[PDB]
């Protein structure tokens, strides 16, 4: 269902692109939780 995107990145930008993609996946996982609301 998620639209498949095209990866247009150099041999070098793949590290950062992977980081961003996994961060987006972590946000999609955060959707699991409910609405969000000393030292």
């Amino acid at each position: 269902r998620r639209i498949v995107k095209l990866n247009l990145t150099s041999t070098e930008g793949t590290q950062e692109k992977l980081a961003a993609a996994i961060q987006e996946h972590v946000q999609d996982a955060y959707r699991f939780s409910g609405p969000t609301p000393p030292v």
Binding site: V4, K5, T9, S10, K17
Partner: protein, 49 residues
């Protein structure tokens, strides 16, 4: 990866999973410091002069 895709057909036109619009250049503008310009020229759709 448009050059060696790990899926049969890269695109599709089902009602909710349309993805041809997201091949536009404007969406790859967000990520330009990482971009591969030849692959962009080859696989981007509404590409300016």
């Amino acid at each position: 990866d448009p050059d060696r895709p790990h899926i049969k057909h890269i695109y599709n036109q089902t009602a909710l999973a349309r993805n041809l619009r997201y091949a536009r250049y404007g969406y790859f503008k967000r990520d330009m410091h990482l971009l591969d310009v030849d692959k962009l020229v080859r696989h981007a759709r509404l590409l300016p002069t």
